[PDB]
Amino acid sequence: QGTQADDLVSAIQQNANHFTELFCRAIDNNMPLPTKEIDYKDDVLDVILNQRRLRNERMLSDRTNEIRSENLMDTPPSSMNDALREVVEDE
Amino acid sequence: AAANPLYGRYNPRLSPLDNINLPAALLSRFDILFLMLDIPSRDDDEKLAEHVTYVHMHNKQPDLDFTPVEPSKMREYIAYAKTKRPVMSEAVNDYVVQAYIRLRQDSKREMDSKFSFGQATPRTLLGIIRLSQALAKLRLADMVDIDDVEEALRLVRVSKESLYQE
Amino acid sequence: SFDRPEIYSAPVLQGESPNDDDNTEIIKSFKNFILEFRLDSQFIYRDQ
Amino acid sequence: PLRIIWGTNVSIQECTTNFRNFLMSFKYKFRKILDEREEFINNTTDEELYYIKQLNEMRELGTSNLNLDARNLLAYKQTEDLYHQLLNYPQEVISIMDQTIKDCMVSLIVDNNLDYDLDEIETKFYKVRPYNVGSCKGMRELNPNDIDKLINLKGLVLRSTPVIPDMKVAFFKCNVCDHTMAVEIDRGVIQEPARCERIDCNEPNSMSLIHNRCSFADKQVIKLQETPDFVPDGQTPHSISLCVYDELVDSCRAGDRIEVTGTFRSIPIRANSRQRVLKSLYKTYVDVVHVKKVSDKRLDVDTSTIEQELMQNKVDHNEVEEVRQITDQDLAKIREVAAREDLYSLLARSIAPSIYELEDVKKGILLQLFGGTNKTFTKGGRYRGDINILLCGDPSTSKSQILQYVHKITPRGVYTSGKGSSAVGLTAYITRDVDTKQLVLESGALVLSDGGVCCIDEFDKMSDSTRSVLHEVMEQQTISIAKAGIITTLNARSSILASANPIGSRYNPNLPVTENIDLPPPLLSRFDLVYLVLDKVDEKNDRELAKHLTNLYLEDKPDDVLPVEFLTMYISYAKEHIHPIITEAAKTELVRAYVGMRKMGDDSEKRITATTRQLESMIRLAEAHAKMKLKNVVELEDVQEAVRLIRSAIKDYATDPKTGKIDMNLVQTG
Numbered sequence: 010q011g012t013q014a015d016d017l018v019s020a021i022q023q024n025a026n027h028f029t030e031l032f033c034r035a036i037d038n039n040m041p042l043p044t045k046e047i048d049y050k051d052d053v054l055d056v057i058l059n060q061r062r063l064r065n066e067r068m069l070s071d072r073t074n075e076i077r078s079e080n081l082m083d084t085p086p087s088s089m090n091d092a093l094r095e096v097v098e099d100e
Numbered sequence: 101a102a103a104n105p106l107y108g109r110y111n112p113r114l115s116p117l118d119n120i121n122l123p124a125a126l127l128s129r130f131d132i133l134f135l136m137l138d139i140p141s142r143d144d145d146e147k148l149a150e151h152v153t154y155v156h157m158h159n160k161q162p163d164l165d166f167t168p169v170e171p172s173k174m175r176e177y178i179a180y181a182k183t184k185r186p187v188m189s190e191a192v193n194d195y196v197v198q199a200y201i202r203l204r205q206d207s208k209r210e211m212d213s214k215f216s217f218g219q220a221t222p223r224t225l226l227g228i229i230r231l232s233q234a235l236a237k238l239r240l241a242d243m244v245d246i247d248d249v250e251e252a253l254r255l256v257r258v259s260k261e262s263l264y265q266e
Numbered sequence: 267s268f269d270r271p272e273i274y275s276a277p278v279l280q281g282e283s284p285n286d287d288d289n290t291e292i293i294k295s296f297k298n299f300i301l302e303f304r305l306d307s308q309f310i311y312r313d314q
Numbered sequence: 315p316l317r318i319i320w321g322t323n324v325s326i327q328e329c330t331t332n333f334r335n336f337l338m339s340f341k342y343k344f345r346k347i348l349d350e351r352e353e354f355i356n357n358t359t360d361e362e363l364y365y366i367k368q369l370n371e372m373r374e375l376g377t378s379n380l381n382l383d384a385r386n387l388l389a390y391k392q393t394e395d396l397y398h399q400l401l402n403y404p405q406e407v408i409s410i411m412d413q414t415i416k417d418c419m420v421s422l423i424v425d426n427n428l429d430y431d432l433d434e435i436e437t438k439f440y441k442v443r444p445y446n447v448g449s450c451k452g453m454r455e456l457n458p459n460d461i462d463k464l465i466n467l468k469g470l471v472l473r474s475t476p477v478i479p480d481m482k483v484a485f486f487k488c489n490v491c492d493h494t495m496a497v498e499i500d501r502g503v504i505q506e507p508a509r510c511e512r513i514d515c516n517e518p519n520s521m522s523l524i525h526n527r528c529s530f531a532d533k534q535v536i537k538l539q540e541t542p543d544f545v546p547d548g549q550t551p552h553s554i555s556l557c558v559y560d561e562l563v564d565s566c567r568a569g570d571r572i573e574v575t576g577t578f579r580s581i582p583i584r585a586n587s588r589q590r591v592l593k594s595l596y597k598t599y600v601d602v603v604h605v606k607k608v609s610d611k612r613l614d615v616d617t618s619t620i621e622q623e624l625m626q627n628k629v630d631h632n633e634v635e636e637v638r639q640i641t642d643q644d645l646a647k648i649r650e651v652a653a654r655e656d657l658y659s660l661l662a663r664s665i666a667p668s669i670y671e672l673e674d675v676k677k678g679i680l681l682q683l684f685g686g687t688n689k690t691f692t693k694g695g696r697y698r699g700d701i702n703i704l705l706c707g708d709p710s711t712s713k714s715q716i717l718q719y720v721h722k723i724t725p726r727g728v729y730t731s732g733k734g735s736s737a738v739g740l741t742a743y744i745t746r747d748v749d750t751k752q753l754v755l756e757s758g759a760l761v762l763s764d765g766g767v768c769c770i771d772e773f774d775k776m777s778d779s780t781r782s783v784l785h786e787v788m789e790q791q792t793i794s795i796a797k798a799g800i801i802t803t804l805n806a807r808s809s810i811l812a813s814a815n816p817i818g819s820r821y822n823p824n825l826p827v828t829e830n831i832d833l834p835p836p837l838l839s840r841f842d843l844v845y846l847v848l849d850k851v852d853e854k855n856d857r858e859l860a861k862h863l864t865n866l867y868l869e870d871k872p873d874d875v876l877p878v879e880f881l882t883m884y885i886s887y888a889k890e891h892i893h894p895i896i897t898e899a900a901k902t903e904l905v906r907a908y909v910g911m912r913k914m915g916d917d918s919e920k921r922i923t924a925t926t927r928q929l930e931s932m933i934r935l936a937e938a939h940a941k942m943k944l945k946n947v948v949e950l951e952d953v954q955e956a957v958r959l960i961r962s963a964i965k966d967y968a969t970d971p972k973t974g975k976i977d978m979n980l981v982q983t984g
């Protein structure tokens with residue numbers, strides 16, 4: 010196509026150990042949602058992972074609600090949401 | 101298993117059981133035992149020498165009339181053959197039973213003679229059944245045919261009687 | 267030639283009931299004092 | 315809404331209600347429908363509430379244990395989820411089951427207004443033992459995602475460690491004021507007090523642990539040799555370590571084939587004794603929940619070998635069943651089979667249906683399975699009715715298959731090969747434990763075979779030094795070890811079933827019997843039966859043999875023969891409840907037969923001479939024949955059948971008393 014692309018294959022062949030978690034981070038960045046719901050015929054590690062993801066979502070929602078209910082400045086909605094998300098994800 | 105006779109060379113003076121220094125039980129456990137005799141002749145040694153010299157010169161088999169099958173191809177075909185589990189119908193069972201009966205009577209008759217390769221055994225019956233099932237597996241059929249048992253009995257006969265009688 | 271292993275934590279259970287003399291509860295009460303104190307009508311400490 | 319235990323999908327309320335409904339409303343006809351068995355449903359047993367009556371008889375007997383079949387949870391519709399929750403999370407679901415079993419025990423007398431007091435029931439701690447949790451996949455095919463799951467395993471017990479005290483409550487005493495506290499263990503950790511609990515005495519480091527006042531519990535470690543149903547390519551068998559607790563301690567003995575269902579566990583192991591540093595690779599073991607020592611495919615264990623063990627089972631209230639419970643219907647079926655005229659041929663025919671003819675061989679195998687009577691002298695002597703059978707013959711006579719069938723049918727035998735066994739490996743040896751790094755005792759093949767049948771294939775290939783061990787086993791049913799760490803007499807009440815070939819690997823009529831057998835006289839005389847199983851070439855015999863081995867290949871899964879379950883329970887009942895005795899009419903026959911054989915032995919080694927052990931073998935065979943027909947006394951026809959079996963085993967009718975040779979075409983009938 011003419012665009013410039015780095016030699017990812019040689020970089021993998023030289024330093025594959027770092028590229029393992031690089032691929033893992035990229036895969037977790039765009040992970041599709043499961044079509045089938047979880048059930049009783051499902052693995053124990055899988056239900057643990059589902060509970061961990063739901064628990065993380067509950068932490069994020071609860072901290073967002075507490076910080077928004079504090080109402081520090083009482084005042085740009087999108088920038089406010091971005092800053093609140095960043096402070097929630099860092100705290 | 102690969103083995104030599106008692107003196108290292110087959111001699112027709114003694115019985116086949118004598119120079120196959122091998123107990124009757126462990127002999128009966130082998131389904132097929134081949135006597136591989138090195139009988140000299142003017143014609144066969146010519147063709148053997150031509151074959152061996154061609155292999156040594158060209159690093160390949162002599163005959164160009166057939167393409168030999170690659171080991172991976174043989175392996176996958178043998179796996180797919182091993183997936184099969186052939187069975188036997190009443191007629192082929194009856195033929196196997198008759199062949200077993202005649203084999204045991206022949207082994208009774210040749211026991212006193214010097215041409216004995218042993219005494220016929222139910223393990224020989226089971227070996228015939230297993231060779232027939234393997235031959236049916238090569239044909240990729242769920243049934244064992246009459247020709248499979250024909251080939252099995254022919255193989256048992258040519259293993260011992262054919263080369264020794266010549 | 268491996269790295270230093272890292273240790274992290276995640277809140278799951280309620281745990282033991284909080285006590286007033288605990289440092290975390292004193293910090294939380296002080297934080298609520300800063301955020302929620304009103305002199306007349308304004309959060310003077312929050313604005314300060 | 316509804317609460318779920320973290321890490322699981324289990325609700326205490328939902329599981330409690332589901333299991334309570336299951337216990338109140340289960341019928342064994344559900345298990346019949348689930349196993350696709352509609353024609354076997356009967357009104358009087360299947361339609362009765364199974365766990366209701368089981369909990370009732372649990373209340374009457376003082377039993378505190380419920381044996382729960384996990385397949386029954388799949389039989390019920392509402393507990394099909396709970397079944398999976400039992401397999402994935404045994405640790406809390408079992409506790410839920412115990413709590414609701416206690417609730418059900420309260421409810422059965424609260425609702426129905428029984429006279430039992432509630433205090434005794436609510437003081438008791440009821441616990442459940444799930445079993446039959448699924449397919450018996452191997453230990454080495456399991457994965458770290460299977461940790462803390464319910465697993466079912468086959469195995470043979472090799473050894474067990476002594477009773478180990480694991481400390482549950484800790485007792486600490488003050489040095490200065492003698493104030494004591496008791497602290498419970500919490501997940502394997504005990505909190506020792508830094509300061510004295512007293513208000514008056516608060517001295518630091520004044521609390522010392524008194525090891526004998528603190529309470530302990532029983533913990534035992536059993537090394538189990540696993541026998542998987544499926545074995546992968548080139549998998550070599552291994553030994554697992556399984557931990558039993560409390561009541562289950564000393565319920566498994568060395569050499570028994572058992573069905574262990576338990577929890578797959580993993581712990582880290584310390585690299586050094588002085589350091590608390592643990593290893594990253596974990597050690598796996600099975601935390602045992604239930605042990606099943608009874609299979610319907612094989613015979614039950616001999617009750618004469620475990621009498622004090624049954625008494626200790628009653629004392630400890632371990633209540634793991636050792637023998638099958640015989641009902642009334644199957645008992646009546648046992649009697650009506652025992653009254654049949656051709657019962658002897660029927661039972662001998664039902665031994666090995668895939669093995670054609672060998673009727674006298676099967677009759678002898680049957681009598682060895684039944685056994686003679688065991689007599690315990692009040693002075694201190696002991697006579698064991700163990701029949702030893704040698705099968706010498708031509709190759710391919712289905713004798714190795716007879717050994718395989720007997721090894722599968724016996725409770726605790728061991729199958730060995732000639733010269734693949736050693737004298738040390740048959741009796742006892744010293745080994746190194748992988749866990750304790752200590753010298754431990756481990757039982758050899760003959761001791762492991764006590765109470766069962768030791769099958770020895772290729773008995774002629776065994777060396778004479780190894781062959782010298784069997785003498786004491788066949789004469790006194792013991793092995794007297796005087797070695798570096800062992801000076802004791804070990805009971806090996808094992809029946810020897812051996813297979814052998816002649817010297818020339820085929821029987822030679824020109825040679826006599828004794829030269830063909832090629833066993834020394836002090837060894838061969840200990841055998842109760844010596845079978846000369848010869849391959850005679852015939853028309854009709856070869857035809858029928860070919861047909862018999864050829865109909866096996868008609869289908870992928872291949873007169874009247876009894877099922878193996880009924881045959882095993884018949885032999886178990888006859889061994890347990892029938893002890894025939896010799897009468898004077900049997901005595902006269904026995905004496906006359908012995909003197910007749912001794913007079914026949916006067917003619918001129920080449921022939922098998924009569925022996926005092928042949929008289930004892932006649933007694934044991936007559937007792938086994940009488941035990942077969944459920945008679946409490948040995949009659950004269952029992953002695954005649956014993957003599958007939960002994961004479962026909964060695965083919966005394968075919969042989970010439972003078973020369974000692976055996977003809978083929980003349981007297982023998984194939």
Ligand SMILES: Nc1ncnc2c1ncn2[C@@H]1O[C@H](COP(=O)(O)OP(=O)(O)OP(O)(O)=S)[C@@H](O)[C@H]1O
Pocket residue numbers: 125126222223226668669670671708709710711712713714715813814815859863
């Ligand atoms: N009378 C028979 N009834 C049933 N199966 C038989 C009979 N005779 C031979 N066979 C079968 O033929 C095969 C021969 O193996 P085995 O008889 O077990 O060997 P063996 O009799 O112990 O003699 P060895 O091994 O040389 S000591 C097995 O598959 C047997 O099941």
Ligand SMILES: [Mg+2]
Pocket residue numbers: 713714771813
């Ligand atoms: Mg054999």
Ligand SMILES: [Zn+2]
Pocket residue numbers: 488489490491492493510511512515516517520
């Ligand atoms: Zn004190």
